[PDB]
């Protein structure tokens, strides 16, 4: 789901790559913990 308007709902995860064994998980538009989104933010990433 390539954007935020799509990434709503539930999706199935699959455990150890086995297609017969699945669990529903809600899907959310996650944002990275280190990002380049304002300059202060960019600097923290560079420091890491």
């Amino acid at each position: 789901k390539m954007t935020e308007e799509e990434c709503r709902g539930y999706y199935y995860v699959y455990k150890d790559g086995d297609p017969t064994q699945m669990e529903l998980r809600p899907r959310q538009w996650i944002h990275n913990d280190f990002h380049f989104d304002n300059v202060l933010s960019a600097m923290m990433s560079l420091f890491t």
Binding site: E6, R8, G9, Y10, Y11, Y12, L24
Partner: protein
């Protein structure tokens, strides 16, 4: 919230006032593509009846 009489010829509780809707699970409902079916398809409940 429908009222669900119990029935024979269906061995389950059922409502004769409207039609249910099944959305599959990985499909989100509320998507414009899905929201627009539940709009136009809502005229079937009169022909169903």
């Amino acid at each position: 919230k429908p009222v669900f009489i119990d029935d024979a010829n269906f061995r389950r509780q059922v409502s004769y006032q409207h039609a249910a809707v099944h959305i599959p699970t990985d499909i989100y409902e509320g998507s414009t593509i899905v929201l627009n079916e539940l709009n136009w398809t809502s005229a079937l409940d009169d022909v169903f009846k």
